[PDB]
Design a protein around this ligand. Structure first.
Ligand code: GDP
Ligand code: EZZ
Ligand code: NA
Length: 163
C-alpha cells in the first residue's frame, strides 16, 4: 500500500498536536507537552485506496528542521485564527520548505485552526489570499469539535498523490 509522510508545521500553540491526536485517536487533548515532537501512524481508506499515513507532529524544540522537511512529502501549515503572528509566520515556514525541497510546487495545505473560537483576528479572506499566492488549498479546522480535521489531512494526502 502507499505510504505518505505528512509534516504538521506552525507556531507554538496553534493546535498542531491537538489536530494530530484528534485525527489519530479521535479525542481533543487540551493539555499536551509543547516540547514533544512525535510521529503517529494510521491506516486509512482515501478514495478507495488503503493508505498508510506517517505524520510528524513538530514541536519547534532552524537548520535542524531540514531533516523532516527532506523526509516530508506534504506539509500541513497551521496557524490559529486568533493568532496574527502565527498567520504571519506561515511565510517563513513556506520559504524554508521551498529551499530544503528545492521546489516551488511542494504539496501543502494552509490550515486555520481553532475555528470554534469567537473574535477571530485573522480573516478567512486573508488566508484565502495567502493560499492563492502559494497555489495551495485553505481549510478551516477545529481540533476541539473535529470540524474539518479529516478534510485538512485527506486534502493534503490528495495534494501529494496528485503531484
Ligand atoms: N478552542 C480550541 N482550542 C484549541 C484547538 N486546538 C488546540 N487548542 C488549544 O490550543 C492550545 C495549544 O494546542 P496544542 O495542540 O498543544 O498546540 P501546538 O503547540 O501547536 O502543538 C491548547 O490549550 C489546546 O487546548 C481548537 O481547535 N480549538
Ligand atoms: C520514520 N517515522 C517513524 C518517523 C517520521 N515520520 C515522519 C513524517 C514526516 C517527516 C519526517 C518523519 C519522520 C522522521 N524522519 C525524519 O527525517 C525526521 C525528522 C524529525 C523527526 O522528529 C522525525 C523524523
Ligand atoms: Na505540540
Amino acid at each position: 500500500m502507499t505510504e505518505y509522510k505528512l509534516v504538521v508545521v506552525g507556531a507554538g500553540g496553534v493546535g498542531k498536536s491537538a489536530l494530530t491526536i484528534q485525527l489519530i485517536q479521535n479525542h481533543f487533548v487540551d493539555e499536551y507537552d509543547p516540547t514533544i515532537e512525535d510521529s503517529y501512524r494510521k491506516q486509512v481508506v482515501i478514495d478507495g485506496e488503503t493508505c498508510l499515513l506517517d505524520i510528524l507532529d513538530t514541536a519547534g524544540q532552524s537548520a535542524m528542521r531540514d531533516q523532516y522537511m527532506r523526509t516530508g512529502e506534504g506539509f500541513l501549515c497551521v496557524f490559529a485564527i486568533n493568532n496574527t503572528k502565527s498567520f504571519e509566520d506561515i511565510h517563513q515556514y513556506r520559504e524554508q520548505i521551498k529551499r530544503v525541497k528545492d521546489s516551488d510546487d511542494v504539496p501543502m495545505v494552509l490550515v486555520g485552526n481553532k475555528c470554534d473560537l469567537a473574535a477571530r483576528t485573522v480573516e478567512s479572506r486573508q488566508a484565502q489570499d495567502l493560499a492563492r499566492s502559494y497555489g495551495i488549498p485553505y481549510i478551516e479546522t477545529s481540533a476541539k469539535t473535529r470540524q474539518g480535521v479529516e478534510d485538512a489531512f485527506y486534502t493534503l494526502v490528495r495534494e501529494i498523490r496528485q503531484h
